[PDB]
Structure 1
Amino acid sequence: ARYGAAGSTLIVVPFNQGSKQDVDALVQYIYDEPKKGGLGWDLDAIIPF
């Protein structure tokens, strides 16, 4: 609300990087099309901190 600029979208998801299943499910959710419940996005950057 304070910083999100025009066109920006922030998607908060629960996620356990300490589980293989969350990793696979998260990438599947990011890359799946919206009609399958995903986002249909192609990541331009990854910041795994």
Structure 2
Amino acid sequence: DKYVLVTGAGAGSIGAEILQGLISGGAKVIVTTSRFSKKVTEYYQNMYARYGAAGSTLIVVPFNQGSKQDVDALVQYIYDEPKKGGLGWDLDAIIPF
């Protein structure tokens, strides 16, 4: 029931080792990638397939934090209801690394 946003959580980082910890505890995490490719999403898919405890969700999203148009668009995607295209979440933690 802890809804987390994690930014700067690329492979081999602190932000990626907290994702294994967050998802293992059952957290629902949005994870930002500034480089969206097949290997990034496959790294995160493997991380969820090996550490994805029951109830945990992991949304890999492209997000440039150097864009204000992405900062306001991402929070709208997180907080808008699924009928509007979003997720309908309420963040219990923000980890902008």
User: Distance in 1 between the 2:90 and 2:66 partners?
Assistant: 23
Q: How many residue pairs get matched? A: 49
Where in structure 2 are there 5+ consecutive unaligned residues? Answer: 1-48
Give TM-score scaled by structure 1 length: 0.99
User: Distance in 2 between the 1:38 and 1:18 partners?
Assistant: 21
Q: How much is the aligned-residue C-alpha RMSD, in angstroms?
A: 0.2
User: Distance in 1 between the 2:57 and 2:67 partners?
Assistant: 26
> What is the SS of the residue equivalent to 1:42?
coil
- Higher RCO structure (Cα 8 Å, ≥6 apart): 2
Higher-helix-fraction structure? 2
User: Distance in 2 between the 1:42 and 1:33 partners?
Assistant: 10
Stretches (4+) displaced over 3 A: none
Give TM-score scaled by structure 2 length: 0.50
Higher-strand-fraction structure? 2
Query: Displacement of 1:9 after TM fit?
Result: 0.2
User: Distance in 2 between the 1:34 and 1:19 partners?
Assistant: 24
Give me the identity figure in percent.
100
User: Distance in 1 between the 2:78 and 2:69 partners?
Assistant: 14
